[PDB]
Amino acid sequence: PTFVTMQRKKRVLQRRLKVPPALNQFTKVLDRASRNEALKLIKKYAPETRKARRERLQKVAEEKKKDPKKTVSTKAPLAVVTGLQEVTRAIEKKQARMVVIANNVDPVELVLWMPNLCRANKIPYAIVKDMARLGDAIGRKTATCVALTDVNAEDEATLKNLIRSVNARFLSRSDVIRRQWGGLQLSLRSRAELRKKHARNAGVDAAAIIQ
């Protein structure tokens, strides 16, 4: 079917051409081990579902219905920041300890600028393999980005170790990331054709050497 051919051909054209660094940086993702650790932490601080939020809100009114003179907070428990608008505000306000960004957002212009914004505010960040896996951690279908603003005491060590790991791959490698182009990758048949051609003409010009 036409859509099957086009999605396969689209992948080919994204490796044959010369990919500018602003796009090639999204193919250089965090390693599998730290990606699993990051998603595990995000899952632990997942936002409360519709059911949980409703029960908490109803209980608050019970306190207020008891004594209307006093005041009871309606704030949600500590959780990761989700949504492009809210994650962006957390970065600009410099509240996020670490940002997790997905690498397959289409259109990519939604998050193409985010690694530069995180670098400009010296906020640790990482680029991970799937926006669907990011959604599973927060209990949604997909998620463009997730920001952590704070964690509990027992998880501070994990967050600090996580920050060090993502800093090695992304924040400390800013000079490499800003300059590394991608693409220009030959096909297997083209590579094999080039390999066999060199092997055919390996020692043809030997007699032209004085030595």
Q: Which residues bind Mg ion (CB under 5 A)?
A: 82-83
- Judged by beta carbon distances under 5 to 8 A according to partner kind, the member of Mg ion, RNA, another protein, none in contact with residue 147 is none
Footprint of RNA on residues 151-170 (CB under 7 A)? 164-165, 167-169
Compose the 91-130 pattern: x for residues touching another protein by CB under 8 A, - for all others. ----------------xxxx-xx---x-------------
Residue 61 CB contacts under 8 Å (≥ 6 apart), including other chains: none
DSSP code, position 165: H
Please state, in angstroms and rounded to a whole number, the distance separating the CA atoms of residues 122 and 100.
14
C-beta closer to Mg ion: residue 89 or 173: 89
70 is an interface residue for RNA by CB under 7 A: no
Q: What is the dihedral of CA 7, 9, 11, 17, to 10 degrees?
A: -150
Q: Between 52 and 181, whose beta carbon lies closer to another protein?
A: 181
Q: Residue type for 82, please?
A: T
Nearest to 122 by CA among 176, 75, 77, 170: 170
Would you tell me which residues interact with another protein (CB under 8 A)?
2, 6, 10, 13-14, 17-20, 22-23, 84-85, 87-89, 107-110, 112-113, 117
